[PDB]
């Protein structure tokens, strides 16, 4: 209790917190700790709720005033640790790195080509030295972007005509396959693809130039609306991957639509013109742009936008795709891997307010590209 000779005497828990109501301080002094009193201040007024062993699944029970706190282990949640944590591809992507699938209320993790599923069933071990998608004041026409470093952009390639002039980009998918836009085929009759390019005016020894052997455009290409604007090139010489030459991983359609396209930002690399009606960039450059919602995308476009196109970029910043990057990939940087989700299609002006770069959707065409990699392979 609170008295004038009681507290005057050194407080004892056996002489205050027992016969008396054990209100406080006499509930703390003798204990001289907030890590022992608070645990004794709830076992004298409302009782210890942990005497019933409520926290199941070997959880920890801590006593509080009016309730108890349960400590549950990994995969256990709920008020009293009675529930297993339901794993879904919506919540933390089902812990899968590349491919998450839902079967019988269970999460199955699978890895793309060049990766093996780990022993624990969650991680993806690369199967080779250079797997896909794995990296190893500036005025005067710079659209918010940075310069591509060595090993940072190895999946980009440039197409040059007979005069060695760059006109379109390309994404390396394998030792033989380059992905670009269909209209790039109409720009030049014959062209060569250079991979590992860092500067068109300087050969640094890492650029490999290949002739194009097989050309496959989309059959449903339309000139009026630029629809189905995608092309596949099979090169005459094999691509030997190295420091500055690496492929990119092709994701799954449903996973790309549910998780990859919900990422806030993506990356597009290219050699194209630095600004509208301007000179071509001497060196490879990349730009990070966010996804644009479909309603404003269709409201801001004077032309028809189908299910195979989407808007990306900034409404206010001077940052958007421009001509010369046609056929360049739009890639999203997931936890440890780059995944292709789009391909540059076009853009009404460059760095223009109220306009967004239109990118061709890879997901609706992946099934076709697979055929293009086995129909003539
Ligand atoms: Ca005391
Ligand atoms: Ca006391
Ligand atoms: Ca006693
Ligand atoms: Ca006492
Ligand atoms: Ca007494």
| Strand 329-334 to 265-270 pairing | antiparallel
| Dist. CA 1 → ligand 1 center (Å) | 9
| Dist. CA 23 → ligand 2 center (Å) | 10
Measured from the alpha carbon of residue 16, the closest ligand is 4
| Dist. CA 36 → ligand 2 center (Å) | 15
Residues carrying an active site annotation: 183, 229, 326
| Tokens, residue 93 | 């992507």
Measured from the alpha carbon of residue 18, the closest ligand is 3
**CB-based contacts of 369, cutoff 8 Å, min separation 6:** 173, 179, 232, 250, 362
Nearest to 257 by CA among 326, 356, 177, 339: 339
Phi, psi angle pair for 341, to nearest 5° = -120, -20
Distance CA 158, CA 251 (A): 23
Overall resolution, Å: 3.6
At residue 310, the 3 state secondary structure works out as strand
Nearest to 323 by CA among 141, 167, 198, 170: 167
Measured from the alpha carbon of residue 14, the closest ligand is 3
Distance CA 297, CA 347 (A): 12
Q: Yes or no: say if 311 and 292 are a contact pair by the CB < 8 Å rule.
A: yes
| Dist. CA 130 → ligand 4 center (Å) | 75
Judge residue 264's burial from the number of C-beta atoms within 10 Å of its C-beta, 0-12 exposed, 13-18 middle, 19 or more buried. Answer: exposed
Q: Yes or no: say if 340 and 250 are a contact pair by the CB < 8 Å rule.
A: yes
CA dihedral 47, 61, 86, 336 (to 10 degrees): 140
At residue 233, the 3 state secondary structure works out as strand
| Dist. CA 15 → ligand 3 center (Å) | 8
At residue 125, the 3 state secondary structure works out as strand
């Amino acid at each position: 209790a609170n008295s004038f000779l009681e507290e005057m005497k050194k407080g004892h828990l056996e002489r205050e917190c027992m016969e008396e109501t054990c209100s406080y301080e006499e509930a703390r002094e003798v204990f001289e700790d907030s890590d022992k009193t608070n645990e004794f201040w709830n076992k004298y007024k409302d009782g210890d709720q942990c005497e019933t062993s409520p926290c199941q699944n070997q959880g920890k029970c801590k006593d509080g005033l009016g309730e108890y706190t349960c400590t549950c282990l990994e995969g256990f949640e709920g008020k009293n640790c009675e529930l297993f944590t339901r794993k879904l591809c919506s919540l933390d992507n089902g812990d899968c790195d590349q491919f998450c699938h839902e079967e019988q209320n269970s999460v199955v993790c699978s890895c793309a080509r060049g990766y093996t599923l780990a022993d624990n069933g969650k991680a993806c071990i690369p199967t080779g030295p250079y797997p896909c998608g794995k990296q190893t004041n500036n005025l005067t026409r710079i659209v918010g972007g940075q310069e591509c470093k060595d090993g940072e952009c190895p999946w980009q390639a440039l197409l040059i005509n007979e005069e060695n002039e760059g006109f379109c980009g390309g994404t390396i998918l394998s030792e033989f396959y380059i992905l670009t836009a269909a209209h790039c085929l109409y720009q030049a009759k014959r062209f060569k693809v250079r991979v590992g390019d860092r500067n068109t005016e300087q050969e640094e020894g890492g650029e490999a130039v290949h002739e194009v052997e097989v050309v496959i455009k989309h059959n449903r290409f339309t000139k009026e609306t630029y629809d189905f604007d995608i092309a596949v090139l099979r090169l005459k010489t094999p691509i030997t991957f190295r420091m500055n030459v690496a492929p990119a991983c092709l994701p799954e359609r449903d996973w790309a639509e549910s998780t990859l396209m919900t990422q806030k930002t993506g990356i597009v690399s290219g050699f194209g013109r630095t600004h509208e009606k301007g000179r071509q960039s001497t060196r490879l450059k990349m730009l990070e742009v966010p996804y644009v919602d479909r309603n404003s995308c269709k409201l801001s476009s004077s032309f028809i936008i189908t299910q195979n196109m989407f808007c990306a970029g900034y409404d206010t910043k001077q940052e958007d795709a421009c001509q010369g990057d046609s056929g360049g990939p739009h890639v999203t940087r997931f936890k440890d891997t780059y995944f292709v989700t789009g391909i540059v299609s076009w853009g009404e002006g460059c760095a223009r307010k109220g306009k967004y770069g239109i990118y061709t959707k890879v997901t609706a065409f992946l099934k076709w590209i697979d055929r293009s990699m086995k129909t003539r392979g």
